[PDB]
Structure formats: structure tokens, C-alpha cells
Ligand binder design. Sequence first.
Ligand SMILES: [K+]
Ligand SMILES: [K+]
Ligand SMILES: [K+]
Ligand SMILES: [K+]
Lengths: 93, 93, 93, 93
Amino acid sequence: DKEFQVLFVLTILTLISGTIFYSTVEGLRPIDALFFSVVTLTTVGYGDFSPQTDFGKIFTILYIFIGIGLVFGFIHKLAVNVQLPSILSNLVP
Amino acid sequence: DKEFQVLFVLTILTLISGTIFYSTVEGLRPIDALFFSVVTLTTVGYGDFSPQTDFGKIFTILYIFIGIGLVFGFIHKLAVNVQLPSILSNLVP
Amino acid sequence: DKEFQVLFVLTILTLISGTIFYSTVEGLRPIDALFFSVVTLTTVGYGDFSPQTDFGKIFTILYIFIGIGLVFGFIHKLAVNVQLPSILSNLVP
Amino acid sequence: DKEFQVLFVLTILTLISGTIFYSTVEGLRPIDALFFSVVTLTTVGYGDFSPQTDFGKIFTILYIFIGIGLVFGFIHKLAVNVQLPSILSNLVP
Ligand SMILES: [K+]
Ligand SMILES: [K+]
Ligand SMILES: [K+]
Ligand SMILES: [K+]
């Protein structure tokens, strides 16, 4: 539970970081910068807001390598430590 | 077997949810909304039907975080608990 | 070793299936159809050759769910049962 | 630690390989070729720099299958063997 909370906070900070970076360097609206950060770190990669600057491209490379680990860690704990038990409880006859 | 069935039903409900959301908010044809939901939760992300509204972008963020866990759980069980044994049976000399 | 071989053959058949489907239904050159099949099942999803027909979209949904399991199984075995040992052997002082 | 170092070097070599290939065959600026290599092997796949030549498409197929294993291995070790302990240390009361 404390584990999920740390991961939750780490994910938030990471996304705020991306939001600030892309709005500044790539000139994205903050909402689009947040959207892009999430779509990037979850490896979805629609591509609509991909970086046009070299600074943006270099940050994105580093952001992916550092961010993917904690975003999927959070997703994994959410799925295993939260969603799993809930669905089960909704089964209990 | 009951596990695969629950996951199958959970995946269906999740996809119906996306289908309804994107057809409503993003104005997609239902088939395109379903297609987009799948392409999103499997992390493929072609990008053709990416959300243009802020409401769409925010939902997509939440949808990804909540949906990826159960979609890949289903894929994983399908692969391990279903495809694996079948291919093996097709080997049995 | 026999495991890697089965997975290798299963991956090939799956890709041939996609190649045939997309060249037929989506009118892709065979090379582009193969490329699209791989880019889809590995979840990269550049998006250049995404399906424009409903038949194409529906197949793609099913193809993703059935194909991702065996493509990543193959990738995983390749990495663990093949690449891992080789790199190690190149270390042995 | 030696494991992380090998993976770090293997990831670098792999990315240099992609960088050289795409700048040569697809005529990308080196920075864009590196960016594309990373976006490919991490399965993000924005799609802006996708290959237009058959040679590019064929290499990309092989590059994905061979590269994804080591890139995610590196990401996994980075997350487990490096990020995990650090965040923990920042907790120690
Ligand atoms: K993509
Ligand atoms: K992707
Ligand atoms: K992906
Ligand atoms: K894309």
C-alpha cells in the first residue's frame, strides 16, 4: 500500500516533468504536453505531438529510458495489487 | 478456465466503454472507436484516430493506465493458458 | 532449442498470414504488408500503413490479440535462450 | 553492476548501428536516425521517421526482433538494479 503510494507519487512527478519540458521546449499547451508524456512513457506513441526540436528529441530519448521503468512498475502494481483483488471481491458468492 | 473467462468479459466491457466514449466525445464511427480503443490499450498506437479534444485526451490518459493492465493480463493468459497447450498438442507424436 | 524452432516457425506463419491479408484487403505491396504485420505485432505501430477498411480494422484487432502472444514469446526466447548466452561467451576470459 | 555495464554498452552499440543505418539508407540526419532507432526499439513508434525504402523496411523488421530484447533488458535492469534501490534510499528515515 505504501509501495503503491510511492509509485503513484513518482509517476506524478515524472509526468509533471514531461509536462513542463514539452510545454517549454516544444511549445505545447500544458494539456497536450501531459498527454504526450503519458503516450510516450506508456509506449503508445500516437505521434501527433512528437518533438520537432533536437533538444526535444534528445530529452525524449532520455525520458523514455528513465521513465518507462517507473510508469510500467506503477501500472503493474496497480493491476496486481489493486485491480486484481477488487474484481475478485466482486465475485465472492 | 474461469480465470480466462473473467478476463475475457473484463476486456469486452473495457472495450465497449472505449467504443462508447470515443464515438460520443471524439465523434468516431463505432467501429473506428473500437479499433482505436484496442490500438490504444495494446500500446500499438497507430495514431490515425488520436483524440482532438481535451476531454478525449484526459480520458485517454486514464483509460491507458486502467486498461493496459487488464488487456495485457488477458493477452498473457490467452497465450499461456490457451495457445501454449494447443500448439503442444499439435506436436504430440 | 526445439522450443525456439517451433516459435520461429509459428512467428513466420503468423507473419505470412498478415502479409497475405493486408496485401489482399488493404491493397498493400507484399513488402509493406509484411512490414505492417511486424510493426503491429511488436506494438511499434508507426501508423503509415494502418487499415482503411472495416474488414482491415476488424482483422487487425483479432490479429493483435492472437499474434502479440507468440511474437513476444519468440522475442523473449530469442533474448534469453540465444542472445544472453552468446554475449556471455564473448566475455569468457 | 558488471551486468548493467555490459547491457549499457550493448544498448549503445545497437543504437549506433541504427543511427548509421538510417542516416545512410533513409537519409536521416544522424540525430533523427538515433531518435528513430530509440523510438523503434522501445516500441513507442511515433512514425515521423518511418522507413520509406524497402531496404529500410527489411532492416527495421530485423532490427526490431534483435534489438527489442536487449533494449528492454537494459531498461529492466536499470529499473530494478538502479532506480529501485535509489528511491528506497531516499525513504530511509
Ligand atoms: K505508435
Ligand atoms: K507503440
Ligand atoms: K508499445
Ligand atoms: K504512430
